[PDB]
Amino acid sequence: KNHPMLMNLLK
Amino acid sequence: KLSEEQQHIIAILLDAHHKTYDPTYADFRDFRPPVRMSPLSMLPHLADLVSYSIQKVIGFAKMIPGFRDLTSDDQIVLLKSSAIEVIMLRSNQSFTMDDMSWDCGSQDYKYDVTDVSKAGHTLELIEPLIKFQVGLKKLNLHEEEHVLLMAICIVSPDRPGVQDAKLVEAIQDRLSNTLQTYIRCRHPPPGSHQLYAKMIQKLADLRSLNEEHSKQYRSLSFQPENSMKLTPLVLEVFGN
Ligand SMILES: CCC(O)(CC)COc1ccc([Si](C)(C)c2ccc(OC[C@@H](O)CCC(=O)O)cc2)cc1
């Protein structure tokens, strides 16, 4: 799957 | 003695922890309320606490020297695999040995073994979890050692799905060498006595706790009525 919320918190 | 580079690593990690750990616990009012007195009455509150904590762990990880230089896929793999362990580690700061509870500033936000069971977990997790908290607390880690241990935990190359394992290992080695050098030159004896080996064993214990929590989490979240009580971030990071 994608992890958009995790990815956004990593930016 | 610590090199300037190693001192910089420690300074970065201390800053990272202090930006992501709030010892006033002021945000806990925003969570869904705890309910005690309903085998799952604490699930909404503790789901919100865990979700909040996942956000903090991500914020800490992104500051670890080198972590953001990994591919985003490896960053995700490392955080998905380590988040529960770093939560267990970072929670030790609120853990009190006087009654085996996590004291987050008030009675409403003081969690004992009953509260954890009221999120669905059983003694098969809670008993080793408490044993881990007591064992970690009795190490009396310096904050330097605490933040190094969380960072080493996150950048573990042997996590399932890691692609650039050698790059992850290179970061972890820098952190491990910093921790060993810190213990030798800044931790007063006898507290340094086999401290590094004991901290490594705590990482092994966290792997065992991870597996048991995941087993129970998968069983709990398999029931859609329980997953409904979680948060989007918990579902994304812990699994759906
Ligand atoms: C399906 C239910 C589910 O499995 C997943 C929703 C339940 O999972 C759980 C995981 C761990 C725990 Si707990 C080790 C008792 C814990 C204790 C204190 C914490 O926070 C203290 C401080 O670190 C915040 C301050 C800050 O960061 O600013 C965070 C966690 C409980 C429940």
Side-chain angles (χ1 to χ4, degrees), chain B residues 20-22 25 28 43 46-47 49-50 52-53 56 84 87-88 90-91 94 102 104 111 116 119 121 129 213 217 220 230 234 238:
Chain B
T20 53
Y21 192 96
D22 177 14
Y25 309 106
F28 280 47
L43 182 54
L46 288 179
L49 172 58
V50 167
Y52 173 89
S53 301
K56 302 304 195 69
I84 185 59
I87 291 169
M88 294 178 165
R90 75 199 311 273
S91 78
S94 66
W102 294 264
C104 296
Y111 315 110
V116 180
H121 287 296
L129 178 54
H213 171 271
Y217 174 87
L220 290 165
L230 303 176
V234 165
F238 283 3

PDB file of all heavy atoms in Angstrom, chain B residues 20-22 25 28 43 46-47 49-50 52-53 56 84 87-88 90-91 94 102 104 111 116 119 121 129 213 217 220 230 234 238, ligand 1:
ATOM      1  N   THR B  20      10.191  16.367  20.402  1.00  0.00           N
ATOM      2  CA  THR B  20       9.144  15.382  20.168  1.00  0.00           C
ATOM      3  C   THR B  20       8.633  14.725  21.438  1.00  0.00           C
ATOM      4  O   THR B  20       7.777  13.837  21.358  1.00  0.00           O
ATOM      5  CB  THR B  20       9.643  14.300  19.200  1.00  0.00           C
ATOM      6  OG1 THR B  20      10.877  13.754  19.682  1.00  0.00           O
ATOM      7  CG2 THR B  20       9.874  14.907  17.821  1.00  0.00           C
ATOM      8  N   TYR B  21       9.136  15.115  22.607  1.00  0.00           N
ATOM      9  CA  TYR B  21       8.655  14.586  23.874  1.00  0.00           C
ATOM     10  C   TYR B  21       8.243  15.765  24.733  1.00  0.00           C
ATOM     11  O   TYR B  21       9.063  16.644  25.018  1.00  0.00           O
ATOM     12  CB  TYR B  21       9.711  13.743  24.599  1.00  0.00           C
ATOM     13  CG  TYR B  21       9.126  12.954  25.755  1.00  0.00           C
ATOM     14  CD1 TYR B  21       8.742  11.628  25.593  1.00  0.00           C
ATOM     15  CD2 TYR B  21       8.931  13.547  26.999  1.00  0.00           C
ATOM     16  CE1 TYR B  21       8.196  10.904  26.644  1.00  0.00           C
ATOM     17  CE2 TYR B  21       8.383  12.836  28.051  1.00  0.00           C
ATOM     18  CZ  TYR B  21       8.015  11.516  27.868  1.00  0.00           C
ATOM     19  OH  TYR B  21       7.472  10.809  28.920  1.00  0.00           O
ATOM     20  N   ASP B  22       6.980  15.776  25.146  1.00  0.00           N
ATOM     21  CA  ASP B  22       6.422  16.854  25.949  1.00  0.00           C
ATOM     22  C   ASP B  22       6.195  16.355  27.366  1.00  0.00           C
ATOM     23  O   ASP B  22       5.174  15.704  27.639  1.00  0.00           O
ATOM     24  CB  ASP B  22       5.111  17.346  25.332  1.00  0.00           C
ATOM     25  CG  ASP B  22       4.441  18.423  26.161  1.00  0.00           C
ATOM     26  OD1 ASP B  22       5.087  18.985  27.073  1.00  0.00           O
ATOM     27  OD2 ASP B  22       3.254  18.698  25.898  1.00  0.00           O
ATOM     28  N   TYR B  25       2.780  16.828  29.069  1.00  0.00           N
ATOM     29  CA  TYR B  25       1.641  16.018  28.629  1.00  0.00           C
ATOM     30  C   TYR B  25       0.410  16.874  28.348  1.00  0.00           C
ATOM     31  O   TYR B  25      -0.726  16.431  28.532  1.00  0.00           O
ATOM     32  CB  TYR B  25       1.327  14.926  29.654  1.00  0.00           C
ATOM     33  CG  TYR B  25       2.568  14.138  30.010  1.00  0.00           C
ATOM     34  CD1 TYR B  25       3.198  14.308  31.238  1.00  0.00           C
ATOM     35  CD2 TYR B  25       3.131  13.256  29.100  1.00  0.00           C
ATOM     36  CE1 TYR B  25       4.336  13.601  31.555  1.00  0.00           C
ATOM     37  CE2 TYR B  25       4.278  12.550  29.405  1.00  0.00           C
ATOM     38  CZ  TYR B  25       4.873  12.725  30.629  1.00  0.00           C
ATOM     39  OH  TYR B  25       6.018  12.018  30.932  1.00  0.00           O
ATOM     40  N   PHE B  28      -2.756  15.725  26.031  1.00  0.00           N
ATOM     41  CA  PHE B  28      -3.561  14.542  26.324  1.00  0.00           C
ATOM     42  C   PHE B  28      -5.044  14.882  26.439  1.00  0.00           C
ATOM     43  O   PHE B  28      -5.894  14.011  26.224  1.00  0.00           O
ATOM     44  CB  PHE B  28      -3.061  13.870  27.604  1.00  0.00           C
ATOM     45  CG  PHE B  28      -1.843  13.003  27.413  1.00  0.00           C
ATOM     46  CD1 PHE B  28      -0.750  13.450  26.683  1.00  0.00           C
ATOM     47  CD2 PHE B  28      -1.789  11.738  27.974  1.00  0.00           C
ATOM     48  CE1 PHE B  28       0.382  12.649  26.523  1.00  0.00           C
ATOM     49  CE2 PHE B  28      -0.670  10.930  27.813  1.00  0.00           C
ATOM     50  CZ  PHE B  28       0.419  11.390  27.088  1.00  0.00           C
ATOM     51  N   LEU B  43      -9.738   1.543  24.774  1.00  0.00           N
ATOM     52  CA  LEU B  43      -9.203   1.519  23.413  1.00  0.00           C
ATOM     53  C   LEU B  43      -9.239   2.882  22.730  1.00  0.00           C
ATOM     54  O   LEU B  43      -8.230   3.256  22.106  1.00  0.00           O
ATOM     55  CB  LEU B  43      -9.937   0.457  22.585  1.00  0.00           C
ATOM     56  CG  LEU B  43      -9.462   0.262  21.140  1.00  0.00           C
ATOM     57  CD1 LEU B  43      -7.951  -0.024  21.078  1.00  0.00           C
ATOM     58  CD2 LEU B  43     -10.244  -0.855  20.473  1.00  0.00           C
ATOM     59  N   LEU B  46      -6.415   5.089  24.363  1.00  0.00           N
ATOM     60  CA  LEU B  46      -5.066   4.576  24.138  1.00  0.00           C
ATOM     61  C   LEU B  46      -4.728   4.522  22.655  1.00  0.00           C
ATOM     62  O   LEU B  46      -3.562   4.685  22.291  1.00  0.00           O
ATOM     63  CB  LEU B  46      -4.897   3.206  24.791  1.00  0.00           C
ATOM     64  CG  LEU B  46      -4.832   3.283  26.324  1.00  0.00           C
ATOM     65  CD1 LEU B  46      -4.700   1.902  26.950  1.00  0.00           C
ATOM     66  CD2 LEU B  46      -3.700   4.201  26.790  1.00  0.00           C
ATOM     67  N   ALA B  47      -5.725   4.321  21.783  1.00  0.00           N
ATOM     68  CA  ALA B  47      -5.469   4.455  20.351  1.00  0.00           C
ATOM     69  C   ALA B  47      -5.008   5.866  20.012  1.00  0.00           C
ATOM     70  O   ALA B  47      -4.095   6.052  19.197  1.00  0.00           O
ATOM     71  CB  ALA B  47      -6.722   4.099  19.542  1.00  0.00           C
ATOM     72  N   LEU B  49      -3.549   7.982  22.101  1.00  0.00           N
ATOM     73  CA  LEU B  49      -2.213   8.128  22.669  1.00  0.00           C
ATOM     74  C   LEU B  49      -1.164   7.480  21.773  1.00  0.00           C
ATOM     75  O   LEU B  49      -0.100   8.062  21.513  1.00  0.00           O
ATOM     76  CB  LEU B  49      -2.180   7.516  24.070  1.00  0.00           C
ATOM     77  CG  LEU B  49      -0.795   7.426  24.716  1.00  0.00           C
ATOM     78  CD1 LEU B  49      -0.164   8.811  24.796  1.00  0.00           C
ATOM     79  CD2 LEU B  49      -0.905   6.812  26.092  1.00  0.00           C
ATOM     80  N   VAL B  50      -1.445   6.265  21.295  1.00  0.00           N
ATOM     81  CA  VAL B  50      -0.502   5.577  20.415  1.00  0.00           C
ATOM     82  C   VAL B  50      -0.325   6.347  19.113  1.00  0.00           C
ATOM     83  O   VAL B  50       0.797   6.513  18.628  1.00  0.00           O
ATOM     84  CB  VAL B  50      -0.960   4.130  20.155  1.00  0.00           C
ATOM     85  CG1 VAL B  50      -0.161   3.514  18.991  1.00  0.00           C
ATOM     86  CG2 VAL B  50      -0.808   3.296  21.416  1.00  0.00           C
ATOM     87  N   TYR B  52      -0.761   9.581  18.531  1.00  0.00           N
ATOM     88  CA  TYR B  52       0.055  10.727  18.909  1.00  0.00           C
ATOM     89  C   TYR B  52       1.521  10.343  19.029  1.00  0.00           C
ATOM     90  O   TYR B  52       2.406  11.063  18.541  1.00  0.00           O
ATOM     91  CB  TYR B  52      -0.483  11.271  20.232  1.00  0.00           C
ATOM     92  CG  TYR B  52       0.315  12.366  20.903  1.00  0.00           C
ATOM     93  CD1 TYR B  52       0.068  13.693  20.608  1.00  0.00           C
ATOM     94  CD2 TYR B  52       1.257  12.068  21.884  1.00  0.00           C
ATOM     95  CE1 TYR B  52       0.759  14.706  21.237  1.00  0.00           C
ATOM     96  CE2 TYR B  52       1.961  13.078  22.524  1.00  0.00           C
ATOM     97  CZ  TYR B  52       1.701  14.396  22.192  1.00  0.00           C
ATOM     98  OH  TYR B  52       2.390  15.415  22.810  1.00  0.00           O
ATOM     99  N   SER B  53       1.789   9.194  19.655  1.00  0.00           N
ATOM    100  CA  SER B  53       3.163   8.757  19.876  1.00  0.00           C
ATOM    101  C   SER B  53       3.843   8.364  18.572  1.00  0.00           C
ATOM    102  O   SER B  53       5.046   8.604  18.400  1.00  0.00           O
ATOM    103  CB  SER B  53       3.188   7.596  20.867  1.00  0.00           C
ATOM    104  OG  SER B  53       2.619   7.981  22.111  1.00  0.00           O
ATOM    105  N   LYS B  56       5.171  11.386  17.093  1.00  0.00           N
ATOM    106  CA  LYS B  56       6.404  11.841  17.737  1.00  0.00           C
ATOM    107  C   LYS B  56       7.594  11.004  17.288  1.00  0.00           C
ATOM    108  O   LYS B  56       8.688  11.539  17.050  1.00  0.00           O
ATOM    109  CB  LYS B  56       6.264  11.784  19.259  1.00  0.00           C
ATOM    110  CG  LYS B  56       5.117  12.602  19.824  1.00  0.00           C
ATOM    111  CD  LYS B  56       5.220  14.059  19.398  1.00  0.00           C
ATOM    112  CE  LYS B  56       4.319  14.946  20.243  1.00  0.00           C
ATOM    113  NZ  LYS B  56       4.810  15.043  21.656  1.00  0.00           N
ATOM    114  N   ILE B  84       6.402   0.632  17.307  1.00  0.00           N
ATOM    115  CA  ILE B  84       5.903   0.112  18.585  1.00  0.00           C
ATOM    116  C   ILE B  84       7.037  -0.012  19.595  1.00  0.00           C
ATOM    117  O   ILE B  84       6.848   0.219  20.796  1.00  0.00           O
ATOM    118  CB  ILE B  84       5.175  -1.235  18.391  1.00  0.00           C
ATOM    119  CG1 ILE B  84       4.559  -1.719  19.711  1.00  0.00           C
ATOM    120  CG2 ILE B  84       6.135  -2.310  17.878  1.00  0.00           C
ATOM    121  CD1 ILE B  84       3.552  -0.756  20.310  1.00  0.00           C
ATOM    122  N   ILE B  87       7.962   3.442  20.912  1.00  0.00           N
ATOM    123  CA  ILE B  87       6.928   3.843  21.862  1.00  0.00           C
ATOM    124  C   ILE B  87       7.167   3.178  23.211  1.00  0.00           C
ATOM    125  O   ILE B  87       7.133   3.830  24.258  1.00  0.00           O
ATOM    126  CB  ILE B  87       5.527   3.524  21.309  1.00  0.00           C
ATOM    127  CG1 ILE B  87       5.204   4.442  20.129  1.00  0.00           C
ATOM    128  CG2 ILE B  87       4.477   3.669  22.416  1.00  0.00           C
ATOM    129  CD1 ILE B  87       3.956   4.014  19.356  1.00  0.00           C
ATOM    130  N   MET B  88       7.431   1.867  23.210  1.00  0.00           N
ATOM    131  CA  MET B  88       7.703   1.183  24.471  1.00  0.00           C
ATOM    132  C   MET B  88       8.917   1.787  25.172  1.00  0.00           C
ATOM    133  O   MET B  88       8.890   2.008  26.388  1.00  0.00           O
ATOM    134  CB  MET B  88       7.898  -0.310  24.221  1.00  0.00           C
ATOM    135  CG  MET B  88       6.622  -0.987  23.737  1.00  0.00           C
ATOM    136  SD  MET B  88       6.857  -2.738  23.396  1.00  0.00           S
ATOM    137  CE  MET B  88       5.155  -3.283  23.303  1.00  0.00           C
ATOM    138  N   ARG B  90      10.316   4.973  24.696  1.00  0.00           N
ATOM    139  CA  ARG B  90      10.120   6.360  25.099  1.00  0.00           C
ATOM    140  C   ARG B  90       9.116   6.467  26.238  1.00  0.00           C
ATOM    141  O   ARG B  90       9.219   7.383  27.058  1.00  0.00           O
ATOM    142  CB  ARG B  90       9.690   7.209  23.889  1.00  0.00           C
ATOM    143  CG  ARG B  90       8.230   7.025  23.437  1.00  0.00           C
ATOM    144  CD  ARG B  90       8.040   7.522  21.990  1.00  0.00           C
ATOM    145  NE  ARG B  90       8.609   8.857  21.798  1.00  0.00           N
ATOM    146  CZ  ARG B  90       7.951   9.990  22.036  1.00  0.00           C
ATOM    147  NH1 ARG B  90       6.691   9.951  22.463  1.00  0.00           N
ATOM    148  NH2 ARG B  90       8.549  11.165  21.847  1.00  0.00           N
ATOM    149  N   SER B  91       8.166   5.524  26.315  1.00  0.00           N
ATOM    150  CA  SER B  91       7.207   5.503  27.416  1.00  0.00           C
ATOM    151  C   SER B  91       7.892   5.301  28.765  1.00  0.00           C
ATOM    152  O   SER B  91       7.320   5.658  29.802  1.00  0.00           O
ATOM    153  CB  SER B  91       6.154   4.422  27.192  1.00  0.00           C
ATOM    154  OG  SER B  91       6.649   3.132  27.516  1.00  0.00           O
ATOM    155  N   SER B  94       7.904   8.094  31.377  1.00  0.00           N
ATOM    156  CA  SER B  94       6.767   8.307  32.263  1.00  0.00           C
ATOM    157  C   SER B  94       6.531   7.145  33.215  1.00  0.00           C
ATOM    158  O   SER B  94       5.703   7.274  34.120  1.00  0.00           O
ATOM    159  CB  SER B  94       5.472   8.529  31.484  1.00  0.00           C
ATOM    160  OG  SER B  94       5.112   7.362  30.774  1.00  0.00           O
ATOM    161  N   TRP B 102       2.389   3.991  33.946  1.00  0.00           N
ATOM    162  CA  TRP B 102       2.879   5.108  33.145  1.00  0.00           C
ATOM    163  C   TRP B 102       2.126   6.361  33.583  1.00  0.00           C
ATOM    164  O   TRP B 102       0.938   6.516  33.286  1.00  0.00           O
ATOM    165  CB  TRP B 102       2.683   4.845  31.655  1.00  0.00           C
ATOM    166  CG  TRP B 102       3.497   3.720  31.080  1.00  0.00           C
ATOM    167  CD1 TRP B 102       4.693   3.826  30.429  1.00  0.00           C
ATOM    168  CD2 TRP B 102       3.157   2.328  31.063  1.00  0.00           C
ATOM    169  NE1 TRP B 102       5.126   2.591  30.020  1.00  0.00           N
ATOM    170  CE2 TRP B 102       4.201   1.651  30.393  1.00  0.00           C
ATOM    171  CE3 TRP B 102       2.076   1.586  31.557  1.00  0.00           C
ATOM    172  CZ2 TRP B 102       4.199   0.276  30.200  1.00  0.00           C
ATOM    173  CZ3 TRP B 102       2.076   0.213  31.370  1.00  0.00           C
ATOM    174  CH2 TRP B 102       3.132  -0.430  30.697  1.00  0.00           C
ATOM    175  N   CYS B 104       1.443   9.998  33.222  1.00  0.00           N
ATOM    176  CA  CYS B 104       1.535  11.116  32.286  1.00  0.00           C
ATOM    177  C   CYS B 104       0.854  12.377  32.822  1.00  0.00           C
ATOM    178  O   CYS B 104       0.050  13.011  32.139  1.00  0.00           O
ATOM    179  CB  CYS B 104       0.955  10.700  30.940  1.00  0.00           C
ATOM    180  SG  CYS B 104       1.881   9.398  30.154  1.00  0.00           S
ATOM    181  N   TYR B 111      -1.629   5.219  33.514  1.00  0.00           N
ATOM    182  CA  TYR B 111      -2.052   3.958  32.915  1.00  0.00           C
ATOM    183  C   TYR B 111      -1.393   2.795  33.638  1.00  0.00           C
ATOM    184  O   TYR B 111      -0.160   2.727  33.717  1.00  0.00           O
ATOM    185  CB  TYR B 111      -1.712   3.939  31.427  1.00  0.00           C
ATOM    186  CG  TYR B 111      -2.094   5.238  30.758  1.00  0.00           C
ATOM    187  CD1 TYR B 111      -1.122   6.129  30.311  1.00  0.00           C
ATOM    188  CD2 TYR B 111      -3.427   5.593  30.616  1.00  0.00           C
ATOM    189  CE1 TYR B 111      -1.476   7.336  29.711  1.00  0.00           C
ATOM    190  CE2 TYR B 111      -3.793   6.793  30.021  1.00  0.00           C
ATOM    191  CZ  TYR B 111      -2.813   7.658  29.571  1.00  0.00           C
ATOM    192  OH  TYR B 111      -3.175   8.851  28.985  1.00  0.00           O
ATOM    193  N   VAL B 116      -4.183  -1.099  30.190  1.00  0.00           N
ATOM    194  CA  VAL B 116      -3.674  -1.690  28.959  1.00  0.00           C
ATOM    195  C   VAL B 116      -4.526  -2.884  28.552  1.00  0.00           C
ATOM    196  O   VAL B 116      -4.819  -3.078  27.366  1.00  0.00           O
ATOM    197  CB  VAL B 116      -2.190  -2.069  29.109  1.00  0.00           C
ATOM    198  CG1 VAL B 116      -1.673  -2.683  27.811  1.00  0.00           C
ATOM    199  CG2 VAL B 116      -1.373  -0.830  29.469  1.00  0.00           C
ATOM    200  N   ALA B 119      -7.530  -2.007  26.570  1.00  0.00           N
ATOM    201  CA  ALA B 119      -7.393  -1.763  25.144  1.00  0.00           C
ATOM    202  C   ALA B 119      -7.367  -3.058  24.353  1.00  0.00           C
ATOM    203  O   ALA B 119      -7.185  -3.022  23.132  1.00  0.00           O
ATOM    204  CB  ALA B 119      -6.130  -0.944  24.856  1.00  0.00           C
ATOM    205  N   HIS B 121      -5.387  -5.904  25.288  1.00  0.00           N
ATOM    206  CA  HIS B 121      -4.195  -6.721  25.410  1.00  0.00           C
ATOM    207  C   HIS B 121      -4.277  -7.620  26.636  1.00  0.00           C
ATOM    208  O   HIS B 121      -5.044  -7.382  27.570  1.00  0.00           O
ATOM    209  CB  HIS B 121      -2.956  -5.831  25.434  1.00  0.00           C
ATOM    210  CG  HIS B 121      -2.647  -5.246  24.094  1.00  0.00           C
ATOM    211  ND1 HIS B 121      -2.294  -6.023  23.012  1.00  0.00           N
ATOM    212  CD2 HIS B 121      -2.683  -3.970  23.646  1.00  0.00           C
ATOM    213  CE1 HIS B 121      -2.110  -5.249  21.957  1.00  0.00           C
ATOM    214  NE2 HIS B 121      -2.337  -3.996  22.316  1.00  0.00           N
ATOM    215  N   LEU B 129       6.018  -6.717  29.098  1.00  0.00           N
ATOM    216  CA  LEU B 129       6.122  -5.272  28.924  1.00  0.00           C
ATOM    217  C   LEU B 129       6.500  -4.589  30.232  1.00  0.00           C
ATOM    218  O   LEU B 129       7.396  -3.735  30.269  1.00  0.00           O
ATOM    219  CB  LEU B 129       4.802  -4.719  28.396  1.00  0.00           C
ATOM    220  CG  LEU B 129       4.746  -3.206  28.203  1.00  0.00           C
ATOM    221  CD1 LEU B 129       5.896  -2.722  27.308  1.00  0.00           C
ATOM    222  CD2 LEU B 129       3.391  -2.793  27.624  1.00  0.00           C
ATOM    223  N   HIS B 213       3.089  -7.921  20.607  1.00  0.00           N
ATOM    224  CA  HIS B 213       2.123  -6.850  20.400  1.00  0.00           C
ATOM    225  C   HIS B 213       1.490  -6.944  19.019  1.00  0.00           C
ATOM    226  O   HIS B 213       0.279  -6.738  18.869  1.00  0.00           O
ATOM    227  CB  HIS B 213       2.766  -5.480  20.585  1.00  0.00           C
ATOM    228  CG  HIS B 213       1.862  -4.361  20.176  1.00  0.00           C
ATOM    229  ND1 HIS B 213       1.817  -3.874  18.887  1.00  0.00           N
ATOM    230  CD2 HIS B 213       0.917  -3.685  20.869  1.00  0.00           C
ATOM    231  CE1 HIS B 213       0.900  -2.925  18.811  1.00  0.00           C
ATOM    232  NE2 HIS B 213       0.344  -2.787  20.001  1.00  0.00           N
ATOM    233  N   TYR B 217      -2.251  -7.167  18.251  1.00  0.00           N
ATOM    234  CA  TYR B 217      -2.809  -6.091  17.433  1.00  0.00           C
ATOM    235  C   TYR B 217      -3.534  -6.643  16.214  1.00  0.00           C
ATOM    236  O   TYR B 217      -4.623  -6.174  15.863  1.00  0.00           O
ATOM    237  CB  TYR B 217      -1.713  -5.119  16.991  1.00  0.00           C
ATOM    238  CG  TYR B 217      -2.235  -4.069  16.034  1.00  0.00           C
ATOM    239  CD1 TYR B 217      -2.800  -2.892  16.510  1.00  0.00           C
ATOM    240  CD2 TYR B 217      -2.193  -4.267  14.650  1.00  0.00           C
ATOM    241  CE1 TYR B 217      -3.299  -1.937  15.637  1.00  0.00           C
ATOM    242  CE2 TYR B 217      -2.694  -3.314  13.776  1.00  0.00           C
ATOM    243  CZ  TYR B 217      -3.242  -2.157  14.278  1.00  0.00           C
ATOM    244  OH  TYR B 217      -3.738  -1.210  13.409  1.00  0.00           O
ATOM    245  N   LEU B 220      -6.810  -8.086  17.368  1.00  0.00           N
ATOM    246  CA  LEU B 220      -7.768  -7.051  17.740  1.00  0.00           C
ATOM    247  C   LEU B 220      -8.274  -6.301  16.515  1.00  0.00           C
ATOM    248  O   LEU B 220      -9.486  -6.103  16.352  1.00  0.00           O
ATOM    249  CB  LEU B 220      -7.132  -6.085  18.735  1.00  0.00           C
ATOM    250  CG  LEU B 220      -6.875  -6.644  20.134  1.00  0.00           C
ATOM    251  CD1 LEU B 220      -5.918  -5.727  20.881  1.00  0.00           C
ATOM    252  CD2 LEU B 220      -8.181  -6.821  20.908  1.00  0.00           C
ATOM    253  N   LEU B 230      -9.739   2.755  16.020  1.00  0.00           N
ATOM    254  CA  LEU B 230      -8.350   3.176  15.880  1.00  0.00           C
ATOM    255  C   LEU B 230      -8.312   4.525  15.160  1.00  0.00           C
ATOM    256  O   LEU B 230      -9.328   5.214  15.024  1.00  0.00           O
ATOM    257  CB  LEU B 230      -7.542   2.098  15.164  1.00  0.00           C
ATOM    258  CG  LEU B 230      -7.607   0.743  15.877  1.00  0.00           C
ATOM    259  CD1 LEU B 230      -6.866  -0.319  15.076  1.00  0.00           C
ATOM    260  CD2 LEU B 230      -7.056   0.852  17.313  1.00  0.00           C
ATOM    261  N   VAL B 234      -2.638   5.015  12.932  1.00  0.00           N
ATOM    262  CA  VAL B 234      -2.380   3.700  13.515  1.00  0.00           C
ATOM    263  C   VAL B 234      -2.609   2.609  12.474  1.00  0.00           C
ATOM    264  O   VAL B 234      -1.774   1.717  12.291  1.00  0.00           O
ATOM    265  CB  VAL B 234      -3.241   3.485  14.770  1.00  0.00           C
ATOM    266  CG1 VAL B 234      -3.256   2.000  15.158  1.00  0.00           C
ATOM    267  CG2 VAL B 234      -2.700   4.350  15.914  1.00  0.00           C
ATOM    268  N   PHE B 238       0.682   0.608  11.780  1.00  0.00           N
ATOM    269  CA  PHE B 238       0.653  -0.709  12.405  1.00  0.00           C
ATOM    270  C   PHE B 238       0.042  -1.767  11.498  1.00  0.00           C
ATOM    271  O   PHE B 238       0.311  -2.958  11.688  1.00  0.00           O
ATOM    272  CB  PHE B 238      -0.136  -0.684  13.719  1.00  0.00           C
ATOM    273  CG  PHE B 238       0.606  -0.088  14.889  1.00  0.00           C
ATOM    274  CD1 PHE B 238       1.881   0.450  14.746  1.00  0.00           C
ATOM    275  CD2 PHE B 238       0.022  -0.074  16.146  1.00  0.00           C
ATOM    276  CE1 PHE B 238       2.546   0.995  15.839  1.00  0.00           C
ATOM    277  CE2 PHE B 238       0.674   0.463  17.234  1.00  0.00           C
ATOM    278  CZ  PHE B 238       1.946   0.998  17.083  1.00  0.00           C
TER     279      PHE B 238
HETATM  280  C1  LIG C   1      -5.150  -2.008  19.555  1.00  0.00           C
HETATM  281  C2  LIG C   1      -4.636  -1.241  20.778  1.00  0.00           C
HETATM  282  C3  LIG C   1      -3.138  -0.944  20.637  1.00  0.00           C
HETATM  283  O1  LIG C   1      -2.429  -2.127  20.380  1.00  0.00           O
HETATM  284  C4  LIG C   1      -2.890   0.007  19.463  1.00  0.00           C
HETATM  285  C5  LIG C   1      -3.718   1.290  19.557  1.00  0.00           C
HETATM  286  C6  LIG C   1      -2.620  -0.384  21.964  1.00  0.00           C
HETATM  287  O2  LIG C   1      -1.241  -0.183  21.825  1.00  0.00           O
HETATM  288  C7  LIG C   1      -0.552   0.342  22.928  1.00  0.00           C
HETATM  289  C8  LIG C   1       0.822   0.491  22.805  1.00  0.00           C
HETATM  290  C9  LIG C   1       1.558   1.003  23.859  1.00  0.00           C
HETATM  291  C10 LIG C   1       0.923   1.371  25.030  1.00  0.00           C
HETATM  292 SI1  LIG C   1       1.961   2.053  26.452  1.00  0.00          SI
HETATM  293  C11 LIG C   1       3.656   1.224  26.415  1.00  0.00           C
HETATM  294  C12 LIG C   1       1.094   1.625  28.079  1.00  0.00           C
HETATM  295  C13 LIG C   1       2.274   3.906  26.343  1.00  0.00           C
HETATM  296  C14 LIG C   1       2.518   4.632  27.503  1.00  0.00           C
HETATM  297  C15 LIG C   1       2.796   5.992  27.436  1.00  0.00           C
HETATM  298  C16 LIG C   1       2.820   6.620  26.201  1.00  0.00           C
HETATM  299  O3  LIG C   1       3.093   7.990  26.080  1.00  0.00           O
HETATM  300  C17 LIG C   1       3.890   8.562  27.081  1.00  0.00           C
HETATM  301  C18 LIG C   1       4.770   9.678  26.497  1.00  0.00           C
HETATM  302  O4  LIG C   1       5.765   9.104  25.708  1.00  0.00           O
HETATM  303  C19 LIG C   1       3.973  10.659  25.631  1.00  0.00           C
HETATM  304  C20 LIG C   1       4.582  12.059  25.784  1.00  0.00           C
HETATM  305  C21 LIG C   1       5.044  12.657  24.448  1.00  0.00           C
HETATM  306  O5  LIG C   1       5.421  11.919  23.503  1.00  0.00           O
HETATM  307  O6  LIG C   1       5.054  13.908  24.283  1.00  0.00           O
HETATM  308  C22 LIG C   1       2.574   5.886  25.047  1.00  0.00           C
HETATM  309  C23 LIG C   1       2.307   4.529  25.102  1.00  0.00           C
HETATM  310  C24 LIG C   1      -0.453   1.223  25.164  1.00  0.00           C
HETATM  311  C25 LIG C   1      -1.191   0.705  24.106  1.00  0.00           C
END
